[PDB]
């Protein structure tokens, strides 16, 4: 669960490192976000050089939370991190490389361009 003023690492090649969450789009008083949910955020730390510069308001999708997800067959998955990928308003990564491993729920929510580039898809 990820709420207002949580901080996420970036699993992308876009020029951002840390991100601060501003909204949890979808609903009118919704509290938390999960794996496969879209978000509005601030860039807090960038990389010297990069398409995305610090201070920008931008959209991102969550992969890889600590309090993870639950599957219909009774099994669970959990990660050691919270991470997101910055998105281009029709679900495409604004970078070209995803880092680290990714949850399989991004298929059902139809981020198919992102499930092509992840190293591992769990």
């Amino acid at each position: 669960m990820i709420q207002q003023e949580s901080r996420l690492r970036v699993a992308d090649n876009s020029g951002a490192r840390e991100i601060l969450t501003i909204k949890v789009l979808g609903g009118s008083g919704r509290k938390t976000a999960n794996i496969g949910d879209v978000i509005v955020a601030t860039v807090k730390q960038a990389t010297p050089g990069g398409v995305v510069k610090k201070g920008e308001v931008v959209k991102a999708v969550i992969v890889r939370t600590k309090s993870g997800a639950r599957r219909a067959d009774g099994s669970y998955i959990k990660f050691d991190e919270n991470a997101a990928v910055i998105i281009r308003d029709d679900k495409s990564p604004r970078g070209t490389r995803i880092f680290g491993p990714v949850a399989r729920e991004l298929r059902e929510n139809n981020f198919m361009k992102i499930v092509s580039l992840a190293p591992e898809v769990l």
Binding site: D73, S75, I77, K78, F79, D80, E81, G100, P101, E120
Partner: peptide, 14 residues
């Protein structure tokens, strides 16, 4: 996996 730790729980009899 790829520099991040992953945990997966299973029931014993699925």
């Amino acid at each position: 996996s790829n520099g991040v730790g992953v945990e997966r729980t299973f029931p014993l009899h699925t």
